[PDB]
Design a protein around this ligand. Structure first.
Ligand SMILES: [Ca+2]
Ligand SMILES: [Ca+2]
Ligand SMILES: [Ca+2]
Ligand SMILES: [Ca+2]
Lengths: 239, 241
């Protein structure tokens, strides 16, 4: 329904002004634990899914916490509105972590999707402000926003050109307002497809890229890899 | 593994070696109304837990008409050239269950993971399972077995198939240089595919007829009967981890 998107855009604007894109008292030296969160959905069951939240030790990337919970969905997926799908499983998993093992609450969270790379209010930023936690947006594919002058063919063209120069990080700039939206980064060996890091909450883009680089073993950062792994495994355990 | 076990297995493969029929006889492709597949999926966390799956598909439409999965207890580890002893017992249990529950869907031929005649003692798992069950089988391997005693080296076969692919071909005879007998055909029947699969005669079927059946069973690189059995066996296995 179009009524639902009309309230969602107003929801994106109210939280737009709330997202903090500065580190403040936070720094890379403060990072002792980094958390990951992912949701796996069932193709055979339209409303059944499994959420998973993990905590890994920084920078050794040793998994120290993992919990998986069966989830009931009330929202379908729509581009630029990913936040509303996973906000409740994230809040549910976050509370179980603070209750079961409160010492393992990580300094920062890695979330699937973008944050500032969005109405400037991606799911990573949306979940961060509503939960009062430090989040980083990491997307495996490029969101396209023609309203900001970013297109997929141009980003991959200048990135492949940047690759010819020998680089590995490329600022993705909004053609309007001249704002850096995300960094197309490549921190893993034997990888050519870039991931897109964007600021989530209580953290800057430049610092977020460093944290993602520390979490990088293969193309997918370890916190996202583990959360993706266990969520899918448990979903196929209850079919 | 034990050396008495390897010596006892070699005598069993030699006993069965000459009992494999690689001729069509009164068999033809037109007779194939159903084609069966069989695969076993194993658990890495449990050394003795596995799930066997047998499926039957309509030929040539490749529509699944039968599927069963059974929990399996293993009494054998995997060793190359001895796959038969690993999967012989679950296959006969699956064949017995199919012949008992729905005997009208018993297929004319089975597609089995691994080789048949393409074997060091000419008694692969497809042939071994075929003769010990009195069923028509075809050996289909996803990777190339190397037999140095027959002059089969992987680098020379894949390079020879690479040149044939550039010429435009799709079938390559794999010949034992020592015996001058064709052991298998490296075939490529799927679009957007360059890595070949290796079809070899199993039992009660010729090599060329087996290749025709595999071509009819080809949708993607993996033939549909093997694809379905592989899929359902692993899916059911992941329910018991
Ligand atoms: Ca996700
Ligand atoms: Ca996922
Ligand atoms: Ca197998
Ligand atoms: Ca398999």
């Amino acid at each position: 329904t179009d009524e639902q998107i009309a309230e969602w855009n107003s929801k994106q604007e109210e939280l737009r002004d709330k997202i903090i894109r500065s580190d403040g008292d936070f720094s890379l030296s403060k990072v002792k634990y980094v958390g990951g969160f992912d949701v796996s959905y069932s193709k055979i069951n339209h409303e059944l899914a499994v959420s998973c939240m993990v905590v890994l030790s920084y920078p050794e990337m040793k998994q120290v916490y993992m919990n998986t919970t069966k989830v009931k969905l009330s929202c379908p997926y729509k581009s630029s509105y990913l936040a509303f799908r996973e906000i409740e499983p994230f809040q549910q998993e976050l509370q179980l972590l603070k209750a079961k093992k409160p010492n393992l609450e990580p300094q920062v969270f890695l979330l699937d999707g973008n944050g500032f790379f969005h109405r400037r209010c991606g799911a990573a930023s949306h979940l961060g402000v509503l939960s009062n936690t430090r989040t980083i947006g990491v997307a495996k594919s490029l969101i396209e926003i023609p309203e900001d002058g970013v297109k997929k063919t141009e980003v991959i063209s200048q990135f492949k050109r940047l690759r010819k120069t020998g680089g590995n990080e490329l600022d993705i700039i909004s053609t309007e307002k001249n704002e850096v939206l995300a960094k197309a980064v490549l921190y893993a060996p034997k990888v050519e497809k870039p991931i897109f890091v964007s600021a989530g909450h209580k953290c800057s883009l430049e610092t977020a890229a460093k944290i993602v680089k520390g979490c990088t073993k293969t193309r997918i950062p370890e916190p996202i890899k583990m959360a993706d792994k266990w969520s899918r495994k448990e979903l196929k355990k209850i079919e």
